[PDB]
Symmetry: D2
Subunit: 293 residues, 4 copies
């Protein structure tokens, strides 16, 4: 199985993509053993990016690696078609889309047609980005089989039965969980890996959990998994999407600028309280020689 990072989008002081900080982060993730980078996912603030900015994000990461899944979805199908077609000039792993978000009560036929449309124009394998809470709808194992053209799925959901169903119904599909808390479990149970937000700031931990589970050292894998869970919990205090920036700086030692409002940067006091929650975890990982310092 794999750890895939849905990579953060660093914004500059004036709210543009900081390509340079993005490249440094990308380099470090690849050097630290991350398998592939998921660009314009939730953790990257995909829905806050224009189609031009979703391209810019791809271009900057592509400077670093070919190991990219390029998320292209949104509520203008022509823009998503255009991004899909432009990816032909990039030797990447695949493209991806979440389901059309915001609008409730969208018919199954229209959902199926949105994805089939993108499969039809895609120059690369297509991955389903399933995120029921964010998008308002679910594209389950059965709908995924009906759509019929997904090479894999990231299933961001707290229901591993639902994730396992993709495998049951689509035996050849790559099936990833979107949770950081299920890295040990996913590797122990025959799934293909995790697209894990927390691998942005603790790629060493996510990779090591996976490796331990693979080696069948489940009690050691769980012990580390449970530590990782505490950082995830700390990150949710002030809002994970903002907190991920602060944590990457804290644990990896380079700056990733700002998120894009209304995903507001943490303030100094929030940043200080968040660091207070994870410093003893940082010491312990250093003690364990998982983190270098």
């Amino acid at each position: 199985p794999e750890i895939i990072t849905p990579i953060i989008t660093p914004f500059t002081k004036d709210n543009r993509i900081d390509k340079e900080k993005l490249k440094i982060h990308a380099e470090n993730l690849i050097r630290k053993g991350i398998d592939k980078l998921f660009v314009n996912g939730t953790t990257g603030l995909g829905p806050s990016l224009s189609p031009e900015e979703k391209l810019e994000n791809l271009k900057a990461v592509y400077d670093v690696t070919n190991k990219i899944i390029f998320q292209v979805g949104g509520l203008n199908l022509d823009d998503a078609i255009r991004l899909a077609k432009l990816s032909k000039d990039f030797d990447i792993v695949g493209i991806a889309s979440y389901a059309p978000y915001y609008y409730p009560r969208m018919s199954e036929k229209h959902l199926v047609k949105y994805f089939k449309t993108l499969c039809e124009v895609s120059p690369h394998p297509v991955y389903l980005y399933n995120y029921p809470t964010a998008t308002g709808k679910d594209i389950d194992a059965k709908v995924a089989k009906e759509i019929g053209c997904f090479t894999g799925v990231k299933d961001t959901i707290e229901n591993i039965i639902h994730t396992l169903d993709y495998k049951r119904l689509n035996p050849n599909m790559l099936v990833y969980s979107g949770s950081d808390m299920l890295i040990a479990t996913v590797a122990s149970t025959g799934l293909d890996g995790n697209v894990a937000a927390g691998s942005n700031y603790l790629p060493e931990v996510t990779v090591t959990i996976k490796k331990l589970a693979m080696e069948r050292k489940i009690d050691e894998a769980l012990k580390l998994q449970f530590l990782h869970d505490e950082v995830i919990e700390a990150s949710r205090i002030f809002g994970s999407l903002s907190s991920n920036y602060v944590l990457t700086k804290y644990f990896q030692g380079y700056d990733l600028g700002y998120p894009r409002p209304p995903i507001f940067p943490l303030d100094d006091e929030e940043e200080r309280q968040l660091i207070k929650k994870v410093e003893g975890i940082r010491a312990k990982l250093v003690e364990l020689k998982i983190l270098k310092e």
Copy 2:
């Protein structure tokens, strides 16, 4: 109380706003007694529009009437600020925003900061577009009072206790329901009216429900409200946002072009089937002398 139309945005065959069809529709609505038009709401596929298209919508509608509430929200705050400031040259009723959508688990503090930021730059009264199922958030009467700067709210929710609460905690606030099925109830109970998707295609009906209810002819208002409910239920068979275009052409006699995929147009068969589902209702409305024929 008032009926306010969240007016449909007509698109051409190549996915641009059809300004001329928009004007004809806007003009018909006002002539049939609609109080104000809500521009770039859900019904207008606002989340599917770029900032530039949201402004283009305002301009076209403004040629017809200044009775406009102009929706500006999105996930890039700078763009929404820009729209708010640009509205200064338009003599309109107000601007509006829904909450930042898609991202789950946004802190109250961040949500409050988003709206207060738009209040601080707004040259017009600000309306809260509350839509918990679509955006994943609720900005309830307590949070609206915190924010402190709303002249009004559109509460798109079926729970009228929730909508009444805006009035109870904010006695000076204008309080609208976003439901078509609550027009009779809202008028009878002392609220300010409805921002009703169905008023795009049966504005005569929504205005008459309101009028009957004001006259305390509650049973007559409900009979009409109940017929209107059946049209709303029909519209949901193939997807209401797509169906709204077909129902407008059918009942009002002009077309509104195409929706924007992934809000896909009904096909000829679906259109035939929807028309069959509402034909008998049209006959009833004609016998009630609400519609001509």
Copy 3:
């Protein structure tokens, strides 16, 4: 429309029904203008009562008034049948049942069969007690219509559209809201009334709300509804079912003994906080002459 009290069950110190206190309470409610009494509802802890206790509740209240709807439902259909048959000797308004509670994902067919069974043996009109949050399933207007034998429904739900749908699909049915917050609204919108837990402790207020709305004094009705809402909200702080006992004592001046654990009575600190939250309301109500003192 009517105000119906789902009457509290007072329990003695040895966890038996305090029949003498129940009778005093029932007599007060009727004297203060309550139309009918709903026995063994949620508010009376019906699900905590054995079939013998449900019958004991009926006999005590029946010593005071025949204006009773007698709730009989539970997870042993033989017992519910026996209670339904036993009620033949009581000259009352109706019997009632909630849907079989606890078990998830019961088939529509089984739910319909349970209700039709009660209808076949019932010597009185049968009322649907609809409470989806509590029972884990909904018996909506369409399922009610398919069941075909309900004289009325109490709809305890936060969705008045759902409640109105009973009237729309079943025009000869009595349709009540289970909410105290909707007395003004239900009266103005053509519904038949409210089975209002808060009428146990402020029967004066619920009746005056309904009277004001009937007189089309909507603003005054809402002003009083909104004060009543504040008392409902305070009752919920420590748990409404327990707080209903304290509030009855506070506003009506007699006590109702203890609830039945695990519906635990409020402790001293909880009572003090609760009273601080309502005493300024209790003064406004005496000033308005709704309460004596």
Copy 4:
């Protein structure tokens, strides 16, 4: 890890417990390798049983084995205390309780008091029966930690994150999933096993999934788990709690009488259609030599 059967309660034609059929079923489960029997759980229709009947169940099963967890909860705390006390004379594994069901919005304080009360009188280890969907509330790992007297938990939820949290926060706690679809995954990821309804009718299957996963044959475990899933799915078509009876007779060759209405028995045709759905699976299980012909 272990498989624990939440054992079915067989009822006679006139709705009493069929003690002799219960004993036959218990003995078979134990002989086929089931580790313990969870008596009066959901699958046994525990909420449908009077305290007396819950005691009859224990005494019947106890004649076969002492490997019993005895579920004693309900909405009359005096009865649950009495049951807990009466278990002193049975040399069993533990007693258990689900949270007080039906009543929504019970304060955490009251929930904690209910379980602490049962712990204080219990002469055996206490197990938490967590089932948020059925009871309307969640007693999560944090609340279980607060209560602080549970020996184990059955987490009937689909979210394995939530289940893993009991072990993360309560290291010495025995932690089981209430899901049949998670047998392979629970065994692989270091949890304690599964309280699996479907082990009533296919104990051979559930014990074999576990064993294969224990031997790290995850591929083979999943294949068999996926077959089992298809039986679980079939049982849900006409209602699992009724269907479990039919499936036990079909797979094990002896009958368990009737369920208790409103958990109605399947009819002859529903039974034929259900058997049609699982015939093909029974065939596979025979080829695989998991079942005898």
